[PDB]
Structures are given as structure tokens and as C-alpha cells.
Design a protein around this ligand. Structure first.
Ligand SMILES: Cc1cc2nc3c(=O)[nH]c(=O)nc-3n(C[C@H](O)[C@H](O)[C@H](O)COP(=O)(O)O)c2cc1C
Ligand SMILES: Cc1cc2nc3c(=O)[nH]c(=O)nc-3n(C[C@H](O)[C@H](O)[C@H](O)COP(=O)(O)O)c2cc1C
Ligand SMILES: [Ca+2]
Ligand SMILES: [Ca+2]
Ligand SMILES: [Ca+2]
Ligand SMILES: [Ca+2]
Lengths: 351, 351
């Protein structure tokens, strides 16, 4: 079984023609020893490479490439497994510096390559990070076979978000929600989860069905980071009254090629909207920044400081489920809902 | 003011080398008369072109190109306004057939171009169709200045979607939801709206703030198409018990560069989740497939057969708003909610 990788990256810093040449030289020497072939091109501070060989050797080489200080933002665009024929059998690593190339026909191709790479970067930011996950594992997302998988589903929202929109300039509202989305997404990702979408002011994320500990850790880490954010913001910053509620439940989600050819999606949680709205209501009603179902609680392996809060319905069936939180100094909180909303409005009014 | 367009398309059918040559010839002759310059490349059934000239002439030429039978799926990747210098001053239209090119350095570039175009096609399906809208109007989406704009917001969902997941194989569930998403998205788009996201089984869409008539027409068209779908499906098809509820409200949405660098979005409706859940609950409680607020009703200019149904809250404030629907043969419907859910389960159980 032969493997072929295509990837693109950005120069981590400015790189001379002689430095690019040196990259291609050691790459060629190492790949020759590995029986690996391919091509490396650069244009306007972007590297493109196709790399092909026995899968074991490719991954070790690829692991090395990801650690090179000379580039960053490495993106695997295609991974072919069980490759049958080499594209570049005579090139251990052929290097093509397009910046130095002045050939008649290659000039318009460089403009096209540039524009297409830039367009591609724009699209990267607007798609689920899981889509690139599927690609690096050798699968076209549009060919995923449908499957049902149990997940821990994460929902956070901003407390009385409507007050921000009523009290602040639109640019400042966006600043606040960007700070919120950035905190949530960074922490969820480092705990091994995936943000699947933003729904208004609400972040939706998945954790593997048996990673409750990571979903709880992520939730507490977010609450702690938001407390630090509120306390460390400048005087009069709107960030001082940025609060979140977080709910966790278990759901069976559907993975597959989902949607309308116009618009596609990789996953659906049926009735996500109702689960999110119900968790939102529980954080408000309970004055508790973190709530989660018994199914989440019993999936956890660590000895969290669990506290039982109440019964509720999360799915819409006539099933009363126990709602828990974590009892820690942070989550101890006497009045939420209307109390916090009034405070937010008073503060933001005088900003 | 000079304009420059970069676009890609797919051959609508197989095209010979001599036919591609003829395209480039008339393009060159017409552009010479228009004082327009550029380059056209083709590779493996894809056209790429850069076109540059006075904006008026470019658009007329571009309008012609969109109507050519010889290609389809035309996608503008970049539109530069107030261009200062031509890229290709000596080329009215230079044609470069990469399929016929066998040059040493161009072979790896063709592989890269191919892979990058394919990757780009995958990403196209997973991003808001509005993102490409912003690009063709000459703006990088990641540079949008934040703005607040009033919209008609559309929310539809599948009635007792959870029964499908409980009664059917996962592949058939996906079939059903794909049929649903395809109907909704096609009709919303032809009525001038934009689907912004799928949230579980729920479609979220915007119409311009004063296009209530189009949002109502789209809603009725979807209900009519689903009725036709249920009636025309084969015996035992799960599509026979595919029902939708639809809610419309007015909201102020925020447009801008929104999200977490990891994940970006072009728009947020604050508390979208709560508005959607409330409309979902109203369609259930009222046994009415279409509900909408008085703000939507009074925004309509046509003389719809409006019927007043009840008061509700949609936003969470202590504001009681009148809920309306359209009284027509279709929407006349005696029992929903638990009635329909039981029917769906019985039917799907015996499929
Ligand atoms: C853009 C780029 C492409 C590279 N391609 C390869 C490659 O194809 N093969 C390789 O062995 N190293 C490649 N490298 C360099 C590795 O990161 C690493 O420096 C090199 O393999 C030396 O490792 P070694 O001394 O353990 O053999 C590349 C580096 C950069 C910046
Ligand atoms: C891939 C492709 C690129 C084209 N590019 C141009 C072009 O740059 N300029 C142009 O006038 N026509 C171009 N055309 C053709 C137009 O669609 C149209 O056939 C042509 O302009 C003749 O119009 P006319 O007789 O009114 O001048 C292109 C067609 C295709 C399929
Ligand atoms: Ca909220
Ligand atoms: Ca109980
Ligand atoms: Ca539903
Ligand atoms: Ca009333």
C-alpha cells in the first residue's frame, strides 16, 4: 500500500531563494533514503507539496514536516491510500520556485494559483474544522457513509445577549461575541471536542460519547476563562458583563453527506434547537452556569464534585431526567436570570 | 475605474481541442473590440479565466459568458474594482489548453491545480452560498464591516423527527432529511432568500426585511411541495410522513466577520435558538404548519388570507405579540402535535 499526500503551508517568516533551495536539497536526500518521491513548489510565501511512498515512511516524514520552524498553517488537501502508481517516480523531491520563474505560460498560471489559494484560505475559515479532519484520513467528505454515533453535545450561550445589541454599537457587539466564540472554541478544541456550529449567540460542539470528563473540563475551563476575562478587562469594557451558560447532554448524532447540494453539512443532531433551548432555560432557572444530564454524569470517569439540582426534560419525550452540575467555588452563584440581565443592562447603559 | 474578474467553471459536455481553440478565438476577437484583456485556461474539463477591462464592458461580456451552453457551474472567485494596471495588457484573450501541454515544469503544476480545484469544490458545498455572493461584489468576506440589518427570519423543522431516527435505518433517515433540506433550500432560494444554516432538523433562512411577501410565498410553496412529495412517494416510502412546521419572525441580524479564526460566520441572529424553539412550539400547539408574527404580517404588501391565531412570546421579553397564519385549504388542519407524532410512528413502524 502506497500513500500520497498533497499539502499547502505558509512561510513562517521570509525565506530566501537559497534557503528554499536548501529545503528542497535535504528533502531530496531524505526522501531518496526513504524511497519517497514528490514535488515542492513555492509562490509568494506559500509552499505546496505532493509526497508519495510507503505509508509508514510518509507519516514519519510528514510528522517531521509539521514541526519545521520555517513554515506554519500546514493543511493536507488530499491523502490517497492504496496508491497504485507514483506521479513523480524520478523525483525524490523536485523543487520549483515559482517566484523565480519567468516563463511565458507560467506567469498567468501563477496568478491563477495565487487567486485560487487565497480563495481557498477564505473558505477554510467558514467550514467545520472536522471537514479537513475527514480529508486527512483519506476520505472525501461527500462520500461519507451515513452512521449514527453517540456524542456528548455541548451548548453554551451568552446571558442576555439582547442587552448588548440594544446598548452598544454594532462593532462593539461583534467584538464581544468574537471574544466569546474565541474562548469557547479554543478550549473545546484543546479538550478534544469539535465546534460544529454557531447558532446565534450559542456555540454547539461535540465530544466523543465517552469523553464526558473532557466535556466537563472544557466547560469549567471556559467558565474560569470568562471570569478571568471579566476581571481583567479595562474599566468600562463591555467584556466585564460577558457571562455564559453551558449545558451538556448526550445525543445520537448522524454523520454523513447531509443537506441540499446547495448547502451541505457533515452532521445533524435532530432537535438540536430544542435541547439547546431547554438547557438555556435550565441555566437561567437554576442560576447555575453549568448543567448536564445524568447520562453525561454517569459517563464521567473522574470523581467530579457533582451536585444534583432538579429534574427536567431535554428531548421532548415524557422522560424526567436528573439534572446535575459541579459544586465548586466558581459555580456557587445565588441569582441569575433576571438578576444578571438587569445588572448587564445597568452596566452597559453607562459604558 | 477598471474591473478584473477571475472565475472557474465546468465543461457542460465534452469539448474538443479544436472547440476550445474556437472559444478562445471568438473571445479574443470580442475582447479586442471591447478593449478587454485576459487569459483562459482549461484542464480536465474545468475552465479558468481572468478578465479585465472597463467595468461596464466586463459585466456585459460576463453576462454573455454565464449563458454559454458549453459550460456550467460558473463561480467568480475574485472581483477587483478600481483596478489600476492590467495583468495581461497584450492578450485580448490568451488561451492555454493545459490538457495538451506536456512541458516538464507544468506537469506537476497541473496535478496541483487539479487537486486544489477539487478541494475547492468540496469546500464550496459546505459554506453559506452568501459567502460567494459577497465575493462577486468585490469584497473579501473577512473584511466586512459589522452592520445591523433587519431581516425576515425563517425557521422550518421536521415534525417528530426523532421517530424517523428510532424507526428507520440511518441511511433512510439521511435520505428523508436530504429530501427535506433540498425542497426547503430550492424554494427559499428561488424566492430570493438565503439559507444560513441547518440546526439539527431545522432550516434557518433570511429574507430582506421588507420581503415578507416572498417569505410567505416560500413558506406556502414548501408546504405545497411537501404535500405533493408525501402523496407522490412510493407505497411504504418514509417520505409519506414527512411534515414540516414553519415559523417566520422579524429580527435584527448582525452581518460581519464573526467567530473564532478557527471558525468564522458571516451573520448572527442573537437568541436564534430561542426564537426557533418558540416557533416550533407554536406550530405544534396550534396544529398549524405556518405561523408568523404581526411584524411579518404588517410587512407584507399583498392581500394574503391572514388569520389571527393567538398571542405568544417570541424573543423572551415580556411582550405579547399576535401570531398569524394564512387560512387556505392547505393550512386547514385539525390535529397536529401528538396526533401527527403517533401517526408517524405507526406508519414508520410498518414500513
Ligand atoms: C516546505 C517544506 C517541505 C519539506 N519536505 C520534506 C520532505 O519531503 N522530506 C523530508 O525528509 N523533509 C522535508 N522537509 C524538512 C523536514 O521538516 C526536516 O527538516 C528534514 O526532514 C530533516 O530531518 P532529519 O535530519 O531527521 O532527516 C520539508 C521542510 C519544509 C519547510
Ligand atoms: C469558457 C468560456 C470563456 C469565454 N470568454 C469570453 C470572453 O472572454 N469574451 C467574450 O466576448 N466571450 C467569451 N465567451 C463566449 C461568450 O459566451 C459568447 O459566446 C461570445 O461572446 C459571442 O457573443 P457575441 O456574438 O454577441 O459577440 C466565453 C465562452 C466560454 C465557454
Ligand atoms: Ca442566549
Ligand atoms: Ca429524578
Ligand atoms: Ca423538530
Ligand atoms: Ca394580542
Amino acid at each position: 500500500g502506497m500513500k500520497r499526500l498533497t499539502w499547502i503551508s505558509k512561510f513562517s517568516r521570509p525565506l530566501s531563494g537559497d534557503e528554499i533551495e536548501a529545503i528542497g536539497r535535504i528533502s531530496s536526500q531524505k526522501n531518496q533514503q526513504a524511497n519517497v518521491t514528490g514535488v515542492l513548489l513555492c509562490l509568494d510565501g506559500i509552499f505546496f507539496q505532493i509526497l508519495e511512498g510507503e505509508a509508514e515512511k510518509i507519516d514519519r516524514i510528514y510528522e517531521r514536516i509539521l514541526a519545521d520552524e520555517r513554515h506554519t498553517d500546514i493543511l493536507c488537501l488530499k491523502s490517497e491510500v492504496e496508491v497504485q502508481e507514483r506521479m513523480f517516480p524520478d523525483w525524490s523531491m523536485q523543487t520549483i520556485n515559482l517566484d523565480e520563474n519567468t516563463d511565458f505560460l507560467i506567469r498567468p498560471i501563477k496568478v491563477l494559483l495565487q487567486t485560487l489559494t487565497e480563495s481557498h484560505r477564505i473558505l477554510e475559515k467558514y467550514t467545520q474544522p472536522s471537514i479537513f479532519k475527514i480529508i486527512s484520513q483519506g476520505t472525501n467528505p461527500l462520500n461519507i457513509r451515513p452512521k449514527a454515533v453517540e456524542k456528548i453535545v455541548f451548548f453554551s450561550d451568552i446571558v442576555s445577549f439582547s442587552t448588548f445589541a440594544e446598548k452598544l454599537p454594532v462593532e462593539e457587539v461583534v467584538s464581544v461575541v468574537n471574544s466569546y466564540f474565541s474562548v469557547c472554541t479554543a478550549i473545546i478544541t484543546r479538550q478534544g471536542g469539535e465546534v460544529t456550529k454557531f447558532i446565534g449567540d450559542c456555540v454547539m460542539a461535540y465530544f466523543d460519547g465517552d469523553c464526558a470528563d473532557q466535556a466537563i473540563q472544557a466547560s469549567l475551563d471556559i467558565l474560569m476563562e470568562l471570569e478571568i476575562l471579566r476581571n481583567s478587562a479595562p474599566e468600562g469594557s463591555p467584556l466585564r458583563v460577558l457571562y455564559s451558560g453551558i449545558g451538556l447532554a448526550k445525543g445520537k448524532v448522524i454523520e454523513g453527506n447531509i443537506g441540499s447540494e446547495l448547502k451541505r453539512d457533515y452532521t445533524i443532531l435532530g432537535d438540536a434547537v430544542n435541547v439547546a433551548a431547554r438547557l438555556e432555560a435550565l441555566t437561567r432557572q437554576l442560576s447555575q452556569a453549568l448543567v448536564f444530564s445524568s447520562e453525561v454524569k454517569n459517563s464521567a470517569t473522574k470523581s467530579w464534585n457533582f451536585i444534583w439540582l432538579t429534574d427536567s426534560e431535554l428531548k421532548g419525550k415524557s422522560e424526567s431526567i436528573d439534572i446535575y452540575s459541579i459544586d465548586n467555588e466558581m459555580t456557587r452563584k445565588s441569582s441569575g436570570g433576571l438578576e444578571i440581565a438587569r445588572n448587564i443592562g445597568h452596566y452597559l447603559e453607562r459604558v
